mmCIF file of C-alpha atoms and ligand atoms in Angstrom:
data_model
loop_
_atom_site.group_PDB
_atom_site.id
_atom_site.type_symbol
_atom_site.label_atom_id
_atom_site.label_comp_id
_atom_site.label_asym_id
_atom_site.label_seq_id
_atom_site.Cartn_x
_atom_site.Cartn_y
_atom_site.Cartn_z
ATOM 1 C CA UNK A 1 230.690 158.533 41.406
ATOM 2 C CA UNK A 2 233.392 159.831 38.508
ATOM 3 C CA UNK A 3 234.238 163.504 39.025
ATOM 4 C CA UNK A 4 235.116 166.553 36.257
ATOM 5 C CA UNK A 5 238.539 168.681 36.927
ATOM 6 C CA UNK A 6 238.045 171.827 35.076
ATOM 7 C CA UNK A 7 240.673 174.599 33.892
ATOM 8 C CA UNK A 8 239.477 177.971 35.073
ATOM 9 C CA UNK A 9 241.052 180.534 32.165
ATOM 10 C CA UNK A 10 239.847 179.938 29.649
ATOM 11 C CA UNK A 11 237.082 177.186 30.195
ATOM 12 C CA UNK A 12 235.342 178.023 33.429
ATOM 13 C CA UNK A 13 236.104 182.110 32.968
ATOM 14 C CA UNK A 14 236.121 184.651 30.371
ATOM 15 C CA UNK A 15 239.450 185.913 31.257
ATOM 16 C CA UNK A 16 241.807 185.831 27.975
ATOM 17 C CA UNK A 17 240.927 188.827 26.593
ATOM 18 C CA UNK A 18 241.299 190.457 30.568
ATOM 19 C CA UNK A 19 244.510 189.086 31.166
ATOM 20 C CA UNK A 20 246.116 189.984 27.949
ATOM 21 C CA UNK A 21 244.790 193.546 28.897
ATOM 22 C CA UNK A 22 246.208 193.567 32.201
ATOM 23 C CA UNK A 23 249.203 191.843 31.118
ATOM 24 C CA UNK A 24 250.457 195.243 29.214
ATOM 25 C CA UNK A 25 248.492 197.694 31.790
ATOM 26 C CA UNK A 26 251.301 196.034 34.118
ATOM 27 C CA UNK A 27 254.637 195.917 31.495
ATOM 28 C CA UNK A 28 252.791 199.769 31.597
ATOM 29 C CA UNK A 29 253.375 200.319 35.051
ATOM 30 C CA UNK A 30 257.257 198.931 35.252
ATOM 31 C CA UNK A 31 258.130 201.190 32.065
ATOM 32 C CA UNK A 32 257.953 198.519 28.980
ATOM 33 C CA UNK A 33 255.891 196.947 26.685
ATOM 34 C CA UNK A 34 256.318 193.817 24.232
ATOM 35 C CA UNK A 35 254.490 192.162 20.857
ATOM 36 C CA UNK A 36 251.344 190.967 21.289
ATOM 37 C CA UNK A 37 252.158 187.692 20.127
ATOM 38 C CA UNK A 38 254.594 187.703 22.616
ATOM 39 C CA UNK A 39 252.203 188.389 25.526
ATOM 40 C CA UNK A 40 249.394 186.222 23.289
ATOM 41 C CA UNK A 41 251.448 183.095 24.155
ATOM 42 C CA UNK A 42 251.049 183.649 27.895
ATOM 43 C CA UNK A 43 248.051 183.827 28.535
ATOM 44 C CA UNK A 44 246.217 181.234 30.755
ATOM 45 C CA UNK A 45 249.665 179.359 32.093
ATOM 46 C CA UNK A 46 251.636 180.218 35.132
ATOM 47 C CA UNK A 47 251.791 184.160 35.949
ATOM 48 C CA UNK A 48 255.173 184.850 37.017
ATOM 49 C CA UNK A 49 256.938 182.914 35.154
ATOM 50 C CA UNK A 50 254.812 184.143 31.639
ATOM 51 C CA UNK A 51 256.104 187.819 33.396
ATOM 52 C CA UNK A 52 259.429 187.024 33.693
ATOM 53 C CA UNK A 53 259.703 185.386 30.227
ATOM 54 C CA UNK A 54 257.584 188.990 28.770
ATOM 55 C CA UNK A 55 260.525 191.055 30.753
ATOM 56 C CA UNK A 56 263.105 188.619 29.292
ATOM 57 C CA UNK A 57 264.906 188.224 33.602
ATOM 58 C CA UNK A 58 265.036 185.421 35.592
ATOM 59 C CA UNK A 59 262.089 184.863 37.250
ATOM 60 C CA UNK A 60 263.899 185.311 41.045
ATOM 61 C CA UNK A 61 264.706 189.053 39.587
ATOM 62 C CA UNK A 62 262.809 191.390 41.787
ATOM 63 C CA UNK A 63 260.977 193.458 38.502
ATOM 64 C CA UNK A 64 259.034 189.746 38.912
ATOM 65 C CA UNK A 65 257.991 189.787 42.346
ATOM 66 C CA UNK A 66 256.511 193.832 41.288
ATOM 67 C CA UNK A 67 255.503 192.615 38.570
ATOM 68 C CA UNK A 68 253.033 190.008 39.677
ATOM 69 C CA UNK A 69 252.271 191.372 42.729
ATOM 70 C CA UNK A 70 250.718 195.055 40.576
ATOM 71 C CA UNK A 71 249.520 192.338 38.434
ATOM 72 C CA UNK A 72 247.053 190.317 41.660
ATOM 73 C CA UNK A 73 246.073 194.312 41.987
ATOM 74 C CA UNK A 74 244.498 194.750 38.768
ATOM 75 C CA UNK A 75 243.366 191.351 37.994
ATOM 76 C CA UNK A 76 241.940 191.376 41.215
ATOM 77 C CA UNK A 77 240.340 195.237 40.822
ATOM 78 C CA UNK A 78 238.945 193.030 37.183
ATOM 79 C CA UNK A 79 236.687 189.979 38.910
ATOM 80 C CA UNK A 80 235.804 191.476 41.901
ATOM 81 C CA UNK A 81 234.020 194.703 38.956
ATOM 82 C CA UNK A 82 233.144 191.512 36.707
ATOM 83 C CA UNK A 83 231.301 188.707 40.034
ATOM 84 C CA UNK A 84 229.465 185.813 38.395
ATOM 85 C CA UNK A 85 230.051 188.226 34.656
ATOM 86 C CA UNK A 86 233.239 187.120 34.676
ATOM 87 C CA UNK A 87 232.330 183.195 33.289
ATOM 88 C CA UNK A 88 230.910 181.814 30.150
ATOM 89 C CA UNK A 89 227.124 181.858 29.340
ATOM 90 C CA UNK A 90 225.678 178.491 30.874
ATOM 91 C CA UNK A 91 228.812 177.673 33.716
ATOM 92 C CA UNK A 92 227.466 177.702 37.167
ATOM 93 C CA UNK A 93 223.930 176.532 35.475
ATOM 94 C CA UNK A 94 226.245 172.993 33.694
ATOM 95 C CA UNK A 95 227.997 172.625 37.292
ATOM 96 C CA UNK A 96 224.813 172.110 38.677
ATOM 97 C CA UNK A 97 223.767 169.531 36.139
ATOM 98 C CA UNK A 98 226.936 167.810 37.097
ATOM 99 C CA UNK A 99 226.791 167.407 40.304
ATOM 100 C CA UNK A 100 222.646 167.250 39.634
ATOM 101 C CA UNK A 101 224.293 163.411 38.115
ATOM 102 C CA UNK A 102 226.133 162.553 40.944
ATOM 103 C CA UNK A 103 229.912 163.946 39.564
ATOM 104 C CA UNK A 104 232.145 165.451 41.917
ATOM 105 C CA UNK A 105 233.983 168.812 40.730
ATOM 106 C CA UNK A 106 237.245 170.032 41.164
ATOM 107 C CA UNK A 107 239.121 172.844 39.605
ATOM 108 C CA UNK A 108 243.027 172.784 38.002
ATOM 109 C CA UNK A 109 244.382 175.945 37.244
ATOM 110 C CA UNK A 110 247.806 177.607 36.454
ATOM 111 C CA UNK A 111 246.901 180.308 38.461
ATOM 112 C CA UNK A 112 248.251 180.808 42.566
ATOM 113 C CA UNK A 113 245.781 179.230 44.737
ATOM 114 C CA UNK A 114 245.132 181.726 46.729
ATOM 115 C CA UNK A 115 243.468 183.781 43.356
ATOM 116 C CA UNK A 116 242.082 180.628 42.582
ATOM 117 C CA UNK A 117 239.557 180.564 45.584
ATOM 118 C CA UNK A 118 239.492 184.296 45.927
ATOM 119 C CA UNK A 119 238.497 184.599 42.105
ATOM 120 C CA UNK A 120 235.865 180.473 42.873
ATOM 121 C CA UNK A 121 234.248 183.367 45.764
ATOM 122 C CA UNK A 122 233.526 186.085 43.412
ATOM 123 C CA UNK A 123 232.073 184.357 40.703
ATOM 124 C CA UNK A 124 229.611 180.908 42.785
ATOM 125 C CA UNK A 125 232.261 178.396 41.423
ATOM 126 C CA UNK A 126 233.176 178.002 45.004
ATOM 127 C CA UNK A 127 229.401 176.263 45.806
ATOM 128 C CA UNK A 128 229.763 173.845 43.781
ATOM 129 C CA UNK A 129 233.210 172.621 43.837
ATOM 130 C CA UNK A 130 234.916 170.453 46.012
ATOM 131 C CA UNK A 131 238.675 170.843 45.196
ATOM 132 C CA UNK A 132 240.027 174.222 44.182
ATOM 133 C CA UNK A 133 244.324 173.311 43.644
ATOM 134 C CA UNK A 134 246.227 175.652 41.937
ATOM 135 C CA UNK A 135 250.003 176.316 40.704
ATOM 136 C CA UNK A 136 251.663 176.459 43.901
ATOM 137 C CA UNK A 137 249.387 173.384 45.568
ATOM 138 C CA UNK A 138 251.770 170.773 44.454
ATOM 139 C CA UNK A 139 254.989 171.121 43.446
ATOM 140 C CA UNK A 140 255.061 170.567 39.758
ATOM 141 C CA UNK A 141 252.426 172.190 38.268
ATOM 142 C CA UNK A 142 250.726 172.086 34.310
ATOM 143 C CA UNK A 143 251.732 169.877 32.158
ATOM 144 C CA UNK A 144 252.319 167.164 33.939
ATOM 145 C CA UNK A 145 249.538 164.888 35.531
ATOM 146 C CA UNK A 146 250.870 166.256 39.724
ATOM 147 C CA UNK A 147 247.868 168.520 39.740
ATOM 148 C CA UNK A 148 245.363 166.837 38.598
ATOM 149 C CA UNK A 149 246.381 163.544 40.537
ATOM 150 C CA UNK A 150 246.053 165.580 43.435
ATOM 151 C CA UNK A 151 243.072 166.614 43.101
ATOM 152 C CA UNK A 152 241.795 163.785 42.598
ATOM 153 C CA UNK A 153 242.596 162.562 45.920
ATOM 154 C CA UNK A 154 240.841 165.197 46.351
ATOM 155 C CA UNK A 155 237.283 164.042 45.361
ATOM 156 C CA UNK A 156 238.104 159.753 46.215
ATOM 157 C CA UNK A 157 238.070 159.792 42.371
ATOM 158 C CA UNK A 158 240.799 157.000 40.661
ATOM 159 C CA UNK A 159 242.499 159.209 38.281
ATOM 160 C CA UNK A 160 241.131 156.458 35.208
ATOM 161 C CA UNK A 161 237.177 158.386 36.200
ATOM 162 C CA UNK A 162 238.148 161.435 36.120
ATOM 163 C CA UNK A 163 237.666 163.510 32.706
ATOM 164 C CA UNK A 164 239.463 166.976 32.390
ATOM 165 C CA UNK A 165 237.988 170.097 30.472
ATOM 166 C CA UNK A 166 240.646 172.868 29.351
ATOM 167 C CA UNK A 167 241.126 174.793 26.905
ATOM 168 C CA UNK A 168 245.338 174.909 26.814
ATOM 169 C CA UNK A 169 247.193 172.376 25.231
ATOM 170 C CA UNK A 170 248.554 171.817 28.823
ATOM 171 C CA UNK A 171 245.256 171.021 30.073
ATOM 172 C CA UNK A 172 245.280 167.740 27.490
ATOM 173 C CA UNK A 173 248.720 166.955 28.661
ATOM 174 C CA UNK A 174 248.081 167.119 32.114
ATOM 175 C CA UNK A 175 244.562 164.688 31.311
ATOM 176 C CA UNK A 176 246.927 162.469 29.395
ATOM 177 C CA UNK A 177 249.898 161.834 31.617
ATOM 178 C CA UNK A 178 247.855 161.268 34.449
ATOM 179 C CA UNK A 179 245.729 158.192 33.239
ATOM 180 C CA UNK A 180 241.881 161.056 32.454
ATOM 181 C CA UNK A 181 240.188 161.548 29.587
ATOM 182 C CA UNK A 182 240.482 165.257 28.494
ATOM 183 C CA UNK A 183 237.538 166.425 26.376
ATOM 184 C CA UNK A 184 239.698 170.062 24.594
ATOM 185 C CA UNK A 185 236.742 173.111 24.211
ATOM 186 C CA UNK A 186 238.005 175.687 21.921
ATOM 187 C CA UNK A 187 235.993 178.165 23.296
ATOM 188 C CA UNK A 188 239.931 179.734 24.635
ATOM 189 C CA UNK A 189 243.200 179.514 23.638
ATOM 190 C CA UNK A 190 243.717 177.073 21.805
ATOM 191 C CA UNK A 191 242.287 176.247 18.012
ATOM 192 C CA UNK A 192 240.430 172.287 18.006
ATOM 193 C CA UNK A 193 243.292 170.761 16.367
ATOM 194 C CA UNK A 194 245.900 171.349 18.909
ATOM 195 C CA UNK A 195 243.798 170.241 21.130
ATOM 196 C CA UNK A 196 243.307 167.042 19.009
ATOM 197 C CA UNK A 197 246.916 166.686 18.980
ATOM 198 C CA UNK A 198 247.776 167.616 22.232
ATOM 199 C CA UNK A 199 246.214 163.764 23.170
ATOM 200 C CA UNK A 200 242.829 165.415 23.532
ATOM 201 C CA UNK A 201 239.203 162.736 23.691
ATOM 202 C CA UNK A 202 237.743 165.198 21.755
ATOM 203 C CA UNK A 203 236.612 168.562 21.572
ATOM 204 C CA UNK A 204 233.773 170.940 21.756
ATOM 205 C CA UNK A 205 232.993 174.654 20.904
ATOM 206 C CA UNK A 206 230.794 175.597 23.974
ATOM 207 C CA UNK A 207 230.808 175.334 27.781
ATOM 208 C CA UNK A 208 226.791 173.965 28.064
ATOM 209 C CA UNK A 209 228.080 171.231 24.992
ATOM 210 C CA UNK A 210 231.264 169.943 27.037
ATOM 211 C CA UNK A 211 229.113 168.899 29.931
ATOM 212 C CA UNK A 212 226.193 167.347 27.283
ATOM 213 C CA UNK A 213 229.691 165.637 26.503
ATOM 214 C CA UNK A 214 229.951 164.616 30.615
ATOM 215 C CA UNK A 215 225.991 163.794 30.508
ATOM 216 C CA UNK A 216 226.097 160.764 27.646
ATOM 217 C CA UNK A 217 229.834 159.467 29.196
HETATM 218 MG MG1 MG B 301 243.031 177.878 30.196
#
């Protein structure tokens, strides 16, 4: 009777490299380019805000919508090409083990909700997850607690009995702010010290290790 709230990019789905590459493809389509470090700094964060920051324009600039739509096309094609291969090894099996032990599972992603659901459907996450929320599901996205509180409500589990698993500082900040335990993972966008400094209770180095941490309590 406990909840596990999982980030998508860099936690369940091995997408950081594809996100960086497709971001670059989209900027090239828009006739431009930015530093590698700038792109890397955005990986896994909300997409329109990230693209606006890389282009150096207001988020409401029409160039942002153009870039976001092009990104959606390219990323959607990538996800259809990958299917379940989009996920890190052990993810579906791990989620099944958590379900078997009586945990209710949710996704909380900085992707928009429609994209999150489509990815869940193409990878097989959909049959494991009770609730899916994205950046547009709530007024205040990561690092605010709201998304985690919203999915906890969806699960019917009080925040106190939920754990957040993610690879980003925003996930750790979201979980801590929501009054939840946080398991950071080091195989995504963040190193372990940064996650500990952001409030992770522990940091593990693989998804199966995160599952073991939850199962053993
Ligand atoms: Mg992430």
